[PDB]
Design a protein around this ligand. Sequence first.
Ligand code: ADP
Ligand code: ADP
Ligand code: SF4
Ligand code: MG
Ligand code: MG
Lengths: 276, 279
Amino acid sequence: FDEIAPDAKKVAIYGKGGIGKSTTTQNTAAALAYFFDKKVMIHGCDPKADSTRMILHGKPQDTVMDVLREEGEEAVTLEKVRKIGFKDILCVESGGPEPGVGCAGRGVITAVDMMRELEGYPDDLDNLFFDVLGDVVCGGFAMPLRDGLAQEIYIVTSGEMMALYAANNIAKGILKYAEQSGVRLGGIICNARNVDGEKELMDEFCDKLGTKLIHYVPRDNIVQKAEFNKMTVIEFDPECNQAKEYRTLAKNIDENDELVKPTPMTMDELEELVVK
Amino acid sequence: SFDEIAPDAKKVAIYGKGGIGKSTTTQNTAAALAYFFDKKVMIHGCDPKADSTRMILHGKPQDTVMDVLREEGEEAVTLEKVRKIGFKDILCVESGGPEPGVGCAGRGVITAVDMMRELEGYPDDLDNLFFDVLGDVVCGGFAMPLRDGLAQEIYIVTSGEMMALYAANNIAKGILKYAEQSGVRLGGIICNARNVDGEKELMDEFCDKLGTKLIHYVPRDNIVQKAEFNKMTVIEFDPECNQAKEYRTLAKNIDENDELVKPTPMTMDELEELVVKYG
Ligand SMILES: Nc1ncnc2c1ncn2[C@@H]1O[C@H](COP(=O)(O)OP(=O)(O)O)[C@@H](O)[C@H]1O
Ligand SMILES: Nc1ncnc2c1ncn2[C@@H]1O[C@H](COP(=O)(O)OP(=O)(O)O)[C@@H](O)[C@H]1O
Ligand code: SF4
Ligand SMILES: [Mg+2]
Ligand SMILES: [Mg+2]
């Protein structure tokens, strides 16, 4: 597993559904490519299949599962599943079986295994991102931790109880495979929802987890404005304040050395924190 | 058999995105069926959060079937330890699940349902049986109520949020998959509102396009948190407040529902176009 892009920083973004992982992952990769001239690649490990939409310009990426299901195994080619977007950013979408068919994470197992057999992860890569579903940590969604695809893990979360609960469960999964695959929690990204005391709550949450608040991403309308124009915030307006926020986060992730084993909290501890 | 499980009872399953209000809606719905309509109700929590029967038992989360199995053992688990009575004699069971990363998150649901069949935990004299299921992913134990046909009527809790409607649309796809196989159907859509203008209108069009009906528009009320701090469900805390009357209306609409349908899920373009139209 160490042969996959050895000179690249392999990162995986986890979090609750709709908490802002696809938005953070895309804008961070765009900032690394546009501002720091880094060769980046995004591998969408979310069954929603829209983790690479704004980098590909409002062009939903045919998932690996979609191509494999209709066309066949021999028909899966790097040119078809792996498309190029903004600042030569490589994009791949795992997808998944239709709801109820089978394991939701299966799509991640097949796409990662096929990407290895097809050599879709260039050696000259600088950064590789895995946008993974964090509502459940199991099967294909737990593969980046179990198999050690990404060594640095970052969990996007907001102030709401459910977002922190999912983040705490992801920390439990990281601890489970920390010694087994050398996976570690880089930091916690806070996709804020403009609430007073949220920034203070996250500081105590990260302190109790034994990690750091890598960045406080504010809620900005420019994200929607850029989305409605089939683009990312960096590509739409790299001079706006939100673009400078993603640039700071991109630099912090790529220059992060404080990788730690988290100390998850009990339900009572987490409940006592949200009320405070 | 599956149909043998409480034959004279209405078997319902509540699905939806995480933190959308499935546990709150299910508990208050069951409390209104037991208090206002004198029905014998039971709740089976199929969510790994393990707090689907918290307010019915009053405050403290219930020991899950997986927890008692992971600590005591297979023979040491009894119907008394896993099924506990709460407000208005409502029976409560919590499936739980494995520790994050260990294995299939839904495995706790299979183990608890099979163990409940063997221990005969579903009384025959039941009137209503609810399953609070995780809807972020429709697979494994979370898809069992659809696949095995534990519940014939399914209700999805959702709001105007894009992700909430996306999860609801995926649940509809899963219902359609097992509709012919196990006779499972979509009863309706419950809207746990977030007090936004045009949200009701959005839900009316969402249900129209899905080929179903908006069973009820549950408003966002602070009395829910107030009742939660007093270790109680809204019905038990103040059955005369407006929110209690809203849950009472929903409870009778579900119990008196016949319009069970095979949904017509929407494409991603159709769903975005709808969210952009109103929002
Ligand atoms: N920093 C932000 N500011 C404003 N809106 C955001 C931000 N991040 C995400 N969003 C919005 O939140 C919604 C969900 O974002 P998304 O990244 O797709 O969540 P996820 O990938 O975790 O499911 C989108 O409509 C997006 O526009
Ligand atoms: N009708 C409502 N009005 C106000 N708050 C609500 C309502 N329904 C749910 N909530 C709140 O939303 C949060 C999540 O509710 P919950 O039922 O646990 O979601 P789920 O079971 O789907 O994860 C809780 O803090 C609860 O107080
Ligand atoms: S391992 Fe996870 S994604 Fe796979 S069937 Fe089980 S709960 Fe679903
Ligand atoms: Mg996404
Ligand atoms: Mg619940």
